[PDB]
Each structure stands twice: as structure tokens, then as C-alpha cells.
Amino acid sequence: LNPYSYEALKENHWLVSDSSKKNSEWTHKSNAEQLIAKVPIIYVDSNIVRCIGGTEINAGHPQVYIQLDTRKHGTPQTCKYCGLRYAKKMD
Amino acid sequence: QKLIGTNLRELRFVFCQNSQRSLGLRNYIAKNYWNLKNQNPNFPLIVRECEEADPYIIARYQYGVEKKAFAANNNEAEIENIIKTLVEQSNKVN
Amino acid sequence: MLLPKNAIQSARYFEIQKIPAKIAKTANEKILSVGVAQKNNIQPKTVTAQGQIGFVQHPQLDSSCQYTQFYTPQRRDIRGRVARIYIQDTNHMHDTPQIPEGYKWTLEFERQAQYKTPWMGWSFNGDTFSKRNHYFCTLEDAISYCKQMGFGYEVSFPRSRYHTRKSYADNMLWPGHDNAV
Amino acid sequence: LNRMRFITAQRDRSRAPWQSPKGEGVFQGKKLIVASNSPFIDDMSIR
Amino acid sequence: PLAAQLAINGNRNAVRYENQNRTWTFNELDAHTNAFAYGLTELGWKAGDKLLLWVEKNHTSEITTAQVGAAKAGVTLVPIYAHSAEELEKALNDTKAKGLLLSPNSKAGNSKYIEVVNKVIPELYNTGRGSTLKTKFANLQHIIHTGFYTFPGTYKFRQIMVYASKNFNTLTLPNVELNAPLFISGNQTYTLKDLISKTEENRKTSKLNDNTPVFVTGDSRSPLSFSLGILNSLLHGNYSVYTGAQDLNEVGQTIRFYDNALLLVDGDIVKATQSLKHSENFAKLGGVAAN
Amino acid sequence: LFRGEHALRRYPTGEERCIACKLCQSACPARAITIETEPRPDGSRRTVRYDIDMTKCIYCGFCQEACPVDAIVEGPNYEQTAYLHEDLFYDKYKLLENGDKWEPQIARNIEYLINQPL
Amino acid sequence: SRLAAHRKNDDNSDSVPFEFTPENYKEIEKILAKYPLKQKRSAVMPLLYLVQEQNNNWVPLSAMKKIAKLLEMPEIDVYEVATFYTMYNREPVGKFHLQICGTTPCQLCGSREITKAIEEYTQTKLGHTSADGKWTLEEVECLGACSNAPMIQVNNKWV
Amino acid sequence: KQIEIFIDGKPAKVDDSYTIFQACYENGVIVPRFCYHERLSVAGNCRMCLVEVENVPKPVAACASQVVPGMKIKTKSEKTRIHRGNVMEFLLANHPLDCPICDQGGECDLQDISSVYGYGISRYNEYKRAVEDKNYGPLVATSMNRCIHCTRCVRFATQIAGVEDLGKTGRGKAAEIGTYVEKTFNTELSGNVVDVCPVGALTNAPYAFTSRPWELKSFYTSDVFDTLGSAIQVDTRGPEIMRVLPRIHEEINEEWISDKTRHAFDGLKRQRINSPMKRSKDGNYEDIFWEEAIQTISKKCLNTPSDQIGAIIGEFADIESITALKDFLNRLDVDNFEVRQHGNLKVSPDFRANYLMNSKITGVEDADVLLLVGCNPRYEAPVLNARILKSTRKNLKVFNIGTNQDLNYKNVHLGNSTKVLKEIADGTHPFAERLKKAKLPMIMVGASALEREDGAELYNTLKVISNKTGVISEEKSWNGFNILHKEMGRINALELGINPTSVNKNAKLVFILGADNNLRPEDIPADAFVVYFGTHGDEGAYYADIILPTAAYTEKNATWVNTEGRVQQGRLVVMPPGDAREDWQIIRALSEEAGVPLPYDSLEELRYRVAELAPHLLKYDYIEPTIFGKVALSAQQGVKTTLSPTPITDYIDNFYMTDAISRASVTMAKCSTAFNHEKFSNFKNLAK
Ligand code: SF4
Ligand code: SF4
Ligand code: SF4
Ligand code: SF4
Ligand code: FES
Ligand code: FES
Ligand SMILES: [Zn+2]
Description:
The structure is cut from a larger assembly and holds eight protein chains of eight kinds.
Chain D: H1 3-14, E1 16-17, H2 43-46
Chain F: E1 5-8, H1 23-27, E2 33-39, E3 45-53, H2 62-66, E4 72-75, E5 89-90, H3 92-115
Antiparallel strand pairs in F: 1-4, 2-3, 3-5
Chain H: E1 2-7, E2 10-15, H1 20-27, E3 50-53, E4 56-61, E5 72-74, H2 78-92, H3 109-116, E6 140-142, H4 152-159, E7 167-169, E8 176-178, H5 191-196, E9 202-204, E10 217-222, E11 231-237, E12 240-246, H6 259-263, E13 270-272, E14 277-279, E15 285-287, H7 290-303, E16 309-313, H8 319-331, E17 369-373, H9 382-395, E18 397-401, E19 412-415, H10 419-426, H11 430-437, E20 442-446, H12 447-451, H13 455-469, E21 472-473, E22 478-479, E23 481-484, H14 488-496, E24 509-513, E25 529-534, E26 546-549, E27 558-561, E28 567-570, H15 583-594, H16 603-613, H17 629-633, H18 660-664, H19 666-679
Parallel strand pairs in H: 1-5, 16-24, 17-18, 17-20, 18-19, 20-23, 24-25, 25-26
Antiparallel strand pairs in H: 1-2, 3-4, 3-5, 6-9, 7-8, 10-11, 11-12, 14-15, 14-26, 21-22, 27-28
Helix pairs in contact in H: 7-15, 8-15, 8-16, 10-13
Bound molecules: iron/sulfur cluster (SF4) (4 copies), FE2/S2 (inorganic) cluster (FES) (2 copies) and zinc ion (ZN).
């Protein structure tokens, strides 16, 4: 799994990936990547999921909507404001 | 005209393309460029045209030495004489 | 940004439009005297917003630049610098800015040393004169300011879209007869 | 004490110095032969 | 002989290249092959001139186009299986080939094809731009590589190709002669008529009907692969699918869609593959043949 | 509403709330905030350098007001006396540490502030 | 008729073959003759209908590319037509593609009761296809025979 | 026909061809828009330009409505305000709340129009539309939830470029603009897609998450990666450069730039030489002072006889640097400015007409037939390729002699060998009659063909063909003979009069002025001493006994002459990195130390010397006409005119890697690895 391979670049949006997630500790001066990677994929029945980054409006990020009806079934989608990743509960 | 290559290192003609002050040099170049080139195959004969530019024949002899001749309102015979003098003066220059 | 044609016909206005011809003073300039003469003969005689040929004018350190304030004991490099006069148009990213641009001539100075300090990586400028651009309503005013302050100036004239016929009917066009070759 | 790393990174963000060869190196005529340091793979050359 | 399918129905698909994912109709195949033939003729190729084939399996489209164009132009092709510069030089000296088409990125031993070619012919390195080759062989005028990069003394396949114009084509294509040699495999030479006879015999033996899509795995340079592949499609209007270096697994996935479809199995491909992951994909293979 | 010492918060999951929109940098009247951002390897829009010059900053509160995700918050700490001028050049490390330490009280105040409009 | 893009399916990959039968080629020739010689771009819809008839009532991506190649038009145009028009099934359907009208006339006449009865008999929900590839339920708009409501259509053919 | 209309009661006069939007723009009243683009077709999708007309009950779309006599337009009326508010509310409905995270935060015309014309508060309180993202490659980042379905991207792709990939697939609110299948948008002009897209749905991926518009300072300069030359804007936040954009220059740039010139500036950010260096016999490089480097170079120059001194001209050489080098070599008695013998351009620098495009970049819009010889406009000067596409769609027939590249427009491939040229010259080829029939024909020849060993013969053949077929016609006052160059440095050298054919076979002292292409060990003798003026160490820094850092095009205030003869001024954006010095200053210091001081100490005096050599270079952004075109291009009697039987090829292999800056760039490497395999094809796309 070479981070500079064409397959890896295409899968990671043409960005060099860090599997260990340790380089961010220096690059962005935080372990937030490691912390967020621990949260598992949240499975949502609906095709579209609403995220506000909290329990109430103004307590998180602006209300956003994520399409879980991916052209490939079951592909998780990550929220842009927070790293939470949601996937459709295919059955 | 056959000894230009050995006598000089470069000839240049800077003039205007639509001015009577340059008409003479313009016509002389248009008529004799190919003759001079055939006489001296590999010698550099540069031609530069700029509007409202003073006619000038620049002869570069050797070791970065150049002589500039003001050829304004000069008949083709005068241009021939000036070029001949520039070519002949190479020995005196070096 | 464009007063009516020949609306102003003052001697001062004509002087502002006209650009001086250089006089060889330095030894290098005297050696290149032919070059100075050629430059004087070739460069445009007057500057107007209708001009189309760019040019560079040397600073005129003369009695005309007496109004400059940037010649002080501590700083002696601002005067005699060369500026750039051009119209800054809106970026290609967007077409309808909240604050539209292109209605004024911008005068700019090339930036000097710019270095990031070690302690925090903050950007620092060796000179504080060329941080902000200057703005003028007319190229005549910009050139007058340059002459008054003793700055040399390059002028690059604007370029705009060529007007072309536009019509929704052009979407539907009959190609022609099939047998046509 | 690790100010050098931060300073070098800040300098490289805008301009990264070229790492010149050091020590003995192979010569082909008047040329020093060094392998390319580009992490990216030359897929067209390889296949 | 090579335009019956165009006369009948040129819109029908002609050949498929699964490895490089490109499918050609009869019209497109004819256009490409005619372009190759015109390019060779313009370069000066004549009837009987020899072109060496040193292209690996992956370049199935290039192999097929070169074969058909050589057949159209009456140029004989000699496949060469050389993993060493000694073998390459021996083959070149023995054949006196006018041209050598090869795959540069292919690896032979510890060196690539382009490196071996340069080693055999050092003159290519210093050859002038647009200058004819002055080599020891005295006849290897043309060197062509099917690669992305360009090297001195070599020309790319697309650069060699020349698409003739409808009203500005001064070139001429000699009429295809059946008896003219086309392939020189080993010490045996196959003519176009003999290849056609081989195609007919193989079809009769394998019960290969018109609508049975043929699959070819491995190198397409073999005379049998040429007979049962592009040649079969151009003669009987069949549908050929080349898998190139793809193993039995990947061949199978393509195979599943096709029904009652003949498979040609390369020995090299068989040894490389370990075992069939999904034997169900071959449940409707119809018939199986071996090179 | 007291504006004390600047700090950077995180979501309950531990992810940073700061997305490099630079709204706080632009609104800072004193030009005391410097932000540089590069895409994170996972692809998040996160800053690589977030500096606040505490000596150049006027504790107005414009930064937290303009923050759209409540990333930068001027928490209640005011006993931030420093003996060295360099100690007042707060960096991303310092701001994140302040947020981690002072999250309880900051969150308690933010609860009431958010509930007031309701 | 769900997504506005290509669904990643193993049975609808680019490697799937598709070839028109000689009868389909003759029909295509007739269609082209009916349309202007230069305006071959107008034969997309008849070509798609022929593809559906030839296949199991759906248009493969390979078939769409073949149509584009035959019509000398961009494949994106064929993609746009297929996605815009809902009568083209871009994915395989069941043996019976039931299409129950749901517009106000049919709704007044009792379309909901008929839909519930169909669901009960077929042991499947609306829109979803039955476990076995036999039934596929869909809700459609006014089919035309409002005065004869409630109504259904099968395979876009029989009302 | 002039027609009188009223805008807010203000009389105005416009011809009937004008639309409402065009009349408003001419009269100075601005109208919001999202989908109307000047260079694209007319569409009425967004309907944000609705205005009020007294006699028209319905709102009228200004963009797609022609003016009518006596029209009473009320753009400031309450009805117009309500129309704008309604359209803006509909647009913002379903629009994601991504302003903080969107890269177009400060350059969003949607935000600006919502602030200026639309209402200040929204009523839509419901679930919004959600659209999956798409992968278009490493050059364009897609966030399709922000798409407004204005089809500007589709129109640009289909019209400006030949690529036909984007389309509005679907119906209703579920419609999605983009490729139906998953594929990358790898067109050479993909960068301009981001510019045309107005709502940040498509953004610059390399520039993504970097900075904001309000914290950038912009400088107008000229492109150098292509010999065509392009008017570009460089945005910088302090020392760092970012977001190179095009700027309107219809004569040369026509608002578009190529991906190379848009994303190759990253090369300047690494592998930069920042100090004079010297290499030991063992090969160990060590940094030294400018004084030491100049002193050793001057000592070598004094010791070395002028006979065995030579120079190589680099790719990015400028007028000032080449003039200084020429003067220094002349004062040292050195006259040969080439050391490479493998490939030299076969063209005389006497007349500008014989090595410049006689017909300007706009000459394609005037020619009826255009014949290319060893040229690939798609890879070299892609903007020129787009212009040729426009010309061939309006009225122009394109023929090609050489390789059959995947041009965006149909072309007639005559051949690839010199047999076609021989036949055309002899007159037996039907294309000779075709040219004679055609009016204002044009011949474009790439510099590689003239750089061939038989370049002189090919050049003479082209001259005779042009003269015989009327490409140079006095009655038509037309000169269609053109040469497309590949080296701005070579163009500058030809302008200054340096002979490209003068090659020093054996040179003991070589001065390499930033040359990195075509260098091979055989060119440099083993015993020679090499001084390399350069800015990158990819190549030429390994052949150098001494290395001198120089300035780049974004760091040097110099002059550049493009392929068509236009002389532009490249301006200083940031100073040279580290201890780098301007190349002309380095040459001046070297001359003074060696004892042959040059007569210029500043840019003004150096430009006076440039005026001495060739005055026309002092008229910036202007093409000086020449009246010696026919004389220069006239075919002489007795010339060789003997061509070789070999294919005519194109030098470009990897479009994203052509020069040292591109090779050092990272974005270009990503583009190469993401596009080379998808774009490589030995066959021709018969579809187009
Ligand atoms: S308190 Fe005000 S001045 Fe200080 S950092 Fe925050 S916004 Fe800037
Ligand atoms: S602290 Fe808030 S306003 Fe400042 S960059 Fe981060 S998210 Fe934007
Ligand atoms: S285009 Fe970007 S900045 Fe503008 S409204 Fe949409 S998300 Fe916000
Ligand atoms: S992606 Fe951008 S340019 Fe394309 S249709 Fe959507 S909003 Fe318009
Ligand atoms: S309501 Fe059923 S067909 Fe119209
Ligand atoms: S600008 Fe008028 S409809 Fe879009
Ligand atoms: Zn979220």
C-alpha cells in the first residue's frame, strides 16, 4: 500500500495518505485525526442524513446534509465540518 | 563585399520602415541583402525595423568593438560608400 | 475615469500628458548616447488613456519633484523608484463582485525583501513603502502624481473583451442540406 | 532546541533548497549521476 | 478478402481488447490497419520486407493492427522470442529485417527491451534527429517501440501510422496476394492462404459457428492465435476478444458474460495462474482449445 | 460573556472544531491572528498553523463572534501573566491546551449563551 | 430509475458485451431512413427501445455506448437521454414490471387499495423488487386512461 | 440599426443586435447573472437577470432577450427587486451551508448577489438536496451539493474545448451535472472549468484549503511555460505565490490559460539553487561566496583562449540576460553561442519575418486553410488549439503533415514523411492546387522540424512552397508563413540576433545559461570547465563545475518576446530566493572582475543597450510590423532542398513535464501519474 501509488492517490483524492495518522501530530499540531478515527461508521436508515455536530442548533457546526445513496452501495461519507462518517444501513 | 566575413564580425541595419529619412537605407537593404548574403554565406547581417527610428549601420569588428554610422537622408551610393569604409577600416581597428 | 474629449485643454494638462526626453548625464548613458536617442525617438510622445503601446519612463529628479515627502535622512530609497500604472480588473473567478474593480488606475511598487522570521514564522517586509497600492481616478492624475513625487513609471494599458453579437437564436441553427458537400 | 526543524519547514513552504550531492559520486563524462529523489512512480516508464 | 465484413455489415463489433478496454468495429479496425499499411508504404516498405515482432502480450491491439497491416501491405512478419541481447542480435543477423517493432518497457532478464536494443545497436544513442540508421546489419532501417516515451533512433507506433485522406491520398496499396508470406514462425513460413486454411480447419474441428465469440489468451503473435482471432473475425465475421496477460481468473470474469464461447489457452498463462477462484464462470464455455 | 484567554475547542468526539475559513483572522481588528492551512492526509480542512499574538490582540471578542463553529473561544481565564515576551506568542499547541483544560467552564457558559435566544 | 448516475454493478460493467441482431440492424436502418440523413442524433430513443426489446427489458451501459458509436454522437448525450426519460430501465427488472398509476384520478378511484392488494399478493413492497426476479412494483403518473381508473401497466406495453 | 431605449428613464442608443444585458452593461448599469457567460452560448436556466419592462407583463430574461424600439426598462423598480429576491430565494433553497469550508468564500458571486439584490433572510426550513461527490482528477475538486445547475461547465467543455464529458443527467431536482460514468476530466484546459463555475461546486484542488481572496496581492505578468505567451495574474500572500489565473487579453490569451501554466508555478517552491556552489573532482558540492565564484570564473576566462570558449542558451533566458551574455562574450572575442551539435535550430536571425509568425495569433481566425508541419497545438500552446477549434468550427480547414495527434477538431492527415513535402514542392500533390484555390492560407511549422538535421532543407522547401502557392501574397497583403517555437530563450536569442547555427565543436570553457533540455554527457567535453547560471538542480547542475543561482520569471523584471513577435514585460512578484542574483547583474559583475566592464549598471542602461541592438523591444505589448517579409522568405536558386525519408515527429512526450520547473513541480507529477496512462494511445480517435 504505497501512499504515492496511483490507486492510493485515486482513493484518497490525489493526496498522500498517512496510515499511522502520526504525521498530523507535527503537521497540524494535534492528534485530532487519531481521536476521530476511533469513532466507527454510523449506520443510518435514510438515504440522506442531517448533521449539526451536536444535540441542538448553535451547539455544533451549521446544519448540513449528506447523501448516503452512493453510486456504490454502502460507501461511507464523511461530514465536512466534523469527521463523523455515515453509511446507509443496506438490507 | 567578398571580404566582409573576415573583416567584420557582424553587420546590423537599424532603421524605420515608413520614413523618408530611412528610405535610402531601406531600399539599399531590400535590393542588396541577398547579394551580400551570397557573397558572404555565414556572415551575420541583421536587419531591424522600428517606426520613427534613426537610420544606423552598426559594424562590429572584433573584441566587442563597434562603429555606428548615421545613414539618414543618404542615397544608395552613400550607403555603399559608408559600408565600404566600414569594411575597409577593419584592418585599422585591428 | 474618462472626461469628455478635449474637455480640458490647459497647459498644465498638456504638460502632464507629455513625457520628457532623457538627457544623457551618466558616463554609461553618454557611452550609450545612441541608445538614448533611439529610445527618445521611438517612445510615445504623449500619454493618454487611448494609448496602446506600453513604455517605461525614468524618474525625473528635477525641480518638478520638489513636492515629495519620502526623502528623509533615515530613508533615501523611496524617491526615484519605478512604479507600475495599470487597471486592475476583477479576478476571473467571479463576474459580479460586491465591490467591483476596474474603475480606477492602480499604481504599484515592486515589493522588496519579504522574509519569514524564525521565532514564529511571521512575514516581514524589509520596506514598508510598497505594501499597499495607490489608486487614482485618471491616468493623467496618476502620471501627475508620479512627476510631482519624482517616481519613474511604467504604464501598461488595459485590455478588454471584444464585443460580439449575442442571441439565443444562435443555439438553433439549420446545418444545411444533407447532400451538401 | 528543535527550532531548526520548524525554521527549515517554514523556509521550505516557500522555497526548498536543492540537496546537492556530497562525497564521492559516479561520473559519466562531465556529469554526476544521481538517482531521482521524486517519491512519485514513473508508471509510463515502468509499464 | 479482408473487406467482406465491411461490405456485409461494417457497424457490427469486430474485436475486443479486454486488457486495454477498447472495442473496435469492422470499420474502425479497417481504418487503423489501412493507416498502418499506408504508413509503412510511405516509409518505403515493399512486398517481402521483413519486420520483427518483439512486443509482449499486453500490447494485443498493437500486435493485431501490425499483423493485419502487414498482411494488407504484403510485408512479412517474424515474431522473435529473445530474452538476451545475444539472441536478439543473432535473430537480426539471420533475418536481415528491414524493421523491428518492439515493446520497450518489457523486461528481459535484468534489462528492458529498449536497453537491449540500444546495447545491440549503440549507434542509436548518437543518431541524428531525422537521420537514417547506419547500423552494422545494414538493413535494419526502421526501429519502432510501443511506449509512451521517445528514444533516439526510434519512432512511435502512432508516429508511424498514417491515416490516408479521402481526396488527398497519393499513396498506393498493393493488392493483397494470398500466396505472399505473412508470418515466419520458427523455421516454417505461413502464407495468407495457408492461414485461411488453418482457420477453416480449426473452425471445423472445434464446431466454431459464426455466432460463437472466440477468446484468445496470451500472446496474439502465434500463428494459431492469429488464425482463430482477428483473421477469423475478418473472414467469417465472428467476434474475437483478446485478454493478453490476464490470468484465468480475470479471463473468467469477462468470459461469464459471453455464452458458448471458445477459449484459446496459452501455456504460459496456465503456469502463471495458480487455480480457478470461481469455476462457475466457465460453466458455459462451450468449447476449449489449446495452442 | 467575559472575554479572558483565547482557546481552541474540540467536538465531543475529539475532532477539532476549527475549519480554516479565516473569518476570525479577517475580523480581528488588530491583525493578531495568523492562519495557514493545508489539507490533512485524511482530507479534512484543518489548519497547519494557528497563531494569536496576545500582545498585539485587543480582547474585543470579534474572533469568537465571527467563528461559525465556536472553535475559537475567549474563555474566562485572565491570570495569564507572562515573564517573557515570547510566552505571549500563543501557538496552536497553547490554544488547544487551553481549550482542553478549560472546556468544562467554557462549555457551561456556552450552554447558557446558546439557550438565551431560545 | 433511482439514481442519476451509473450504479456500480458487476453485471453492468463496461466489459458486458452487447450486439444488435440483424433484425435490429434492419430496424435501425429503417429508423435512420425515416429521420433526416444528417440528423442521425434523433434516433437515440428508438435505439434505446430496440435495446430494451433485445435485452431483458433494460439498457446496459455497453449498449448505450454502442448506440452512441453507431449514431456518431457523444456517449454523454445518450447517458443524458437515458437518465432523463424514465421508461428506460437502466438496471435489470423482474419478469413483470408492474406500474400502478398514482395520480389524483386513480387515487380517487382507489389506487391505494389496489396497490395494497398487489403488495399483499406479491409479498413485496412498493418500488422494491421481489426476492425472486419475478415481480417489480413501481408507482407512475397518469397513464392516460383516467376514466378507466384504477389502472396498471406491465412492461410499458399492456394496460 | 441604432435604436433608442430607456433604462430607468435614461435615454440610450444601441443597435438592434444588442441584448438587454449587453445594453445595460454598455450603459453602465450592472445586472446579476449566474449562467450567462460572454464567451459561452446563451442559456436562460438560472433566470437571475429578470428585469421589468413596462409593456411586458412577464419578467424578461435580460441575458437572452434582444432590445426593442421604445423599450422601457425599470431595473430599479420594486417589481425588479421582488423578481431578484424570488430567484435568489429559489437558488439558495437546497444550497448547503458550506461558506466556511468552501474555497470560494470571498469570490462567490452568489454570496455577492444575495447580499446586494436578494432578501436578507430565508424561509426554507426543510431537508435540502444532497448529491454525491465526483472524482475529476487531481486538478478539480468537486462538491456537487453547491452546484446550481447553470451548465456553464458543460457549455465550456463542449464549446471552448473539444472534450465532451459533462452533461446534465437526470430530471427534476434530482438532476446532476457531470459525467454519468466515473471518469476524470483530463482536458488540458481543465483549470478554466473552475473559473467558469461560479458557485464553488468545482474548485482548484492543488489550491484547495490554502488561503482566502481578501488576503492576496495580485500582479499582472506574462506566462513563460509556453512560447505563445499568456497574460496571467499572480496572487501572493507575502513571499508565497499561489493561484495563478488568466486575465483578459483577447489578442493572445483570449481569457484562457493551459493547465501547465496554471499549475507549474509549484516548481519554483523547491529544488531551488540559493547560493553559488563549486564541485570538487570527487563530486562534492560546496557553497562559496559570490566574490570567490566570480573571481575563479574570471581567472578561467582570462586563462582560456577565446577560441575554445562557448555558450548554451537556456529555455527561460530573457532579453536582458541574453544581451549581457552576448556583450560579455563579444568583449572576450567569443562569437559561438552554441555547444550542442546534436540538435540546432536551422533558421537565420537576420529578419524577424523568417523566424516569427508573420500572421499573428489572430491569423487563424482569418485563414481559410491551415497546414501544420510537425506541430501539436494541443500539447504546445493549448490556448492556440482552442482558437484553432473556434476557427475550424466557423470557417477553416486543417491539414497535418506529421504525427496524427488527438486534436479536438477534425483534420486531414496528409502524411508523416518528407515525401509529402517533396510532392507539394514539385506541384504534383493535389494540396498545391488546394492551396492555390484557397485564399489566405497559413503554414504553421513547429521548431522541431527546423531543428532536424535537414532543417535548412525543410525550411527552404517550405519557403518555395509558400511562394509558389501564394502563402506570401502581395495582392492579398498576406503572409501566412509561421513558425511555432518551443523555447522562449531561443526566441529572445533570435530577436537579439544570435545565430543558432554557430556551434563550437570543441569548447574548453562552457557557459550554460540555464539550459536543462537536450543536455547529454557527449555535448560537454570531459576536460571542459562548466559555469551554469540556473535556478533548479534537476539538470545542468550536474555538468557544472560552478553553479550560479539566477532569478525566475516571477522574480526577474525583464522582457520576453513571444512566438508571434509580441514583446511583453515580465514583472517582479517576489525577489529571488536566498542569495540568488539577477543573471544580467551576475554577467555584469563577472565582466567587471574579468576586466571588460559593460556600459550598463542598471536596468535602464541595460535597456538602452537593448535599444541600441534592436529598438523595437522597447515598445512593450506590441508587435512591430516588418516590410521585408517577402525578401526574407523568398526562395533562392541553387539551394539544397534535399529532404530525408524519415517521419516528422513532435518533441513533447509528457505535456506536464517539459521544463525544469515542471519537472520539479509536485502538482505536475500528480497530473502526470493521473493522466499519462489514460491519455496514452497509439491509435487515433476516429470519433472526432
Ligand atoms: S480578542 Fe479580538 S484582537 Fe484578540 S485575537 Fe480575538 S479577535 Fe483578535
Ligand atoms: S477559529 Fe473559527 S473562525 Fe477561526 S478559522 Fe477556525 S473555524 Fe474559522
Ligand atoms: S458557493 Fe460556496 S461560499 Fe457561495 S454560498 Fe455556496 S457554499 Fe457558500
Ligand atoms: S458544477 Fe458549477 S459550473 Fe457546473 S453546473 Fe454546477 S454550478 Fe454550474
Ligand atoms: S390517472 Fe391513471 S392513466 Fe391517468
Ligand atoms: S444570466 Fe439570465 S438566465 Fe442566467
Ligand atoms: Zn458534522
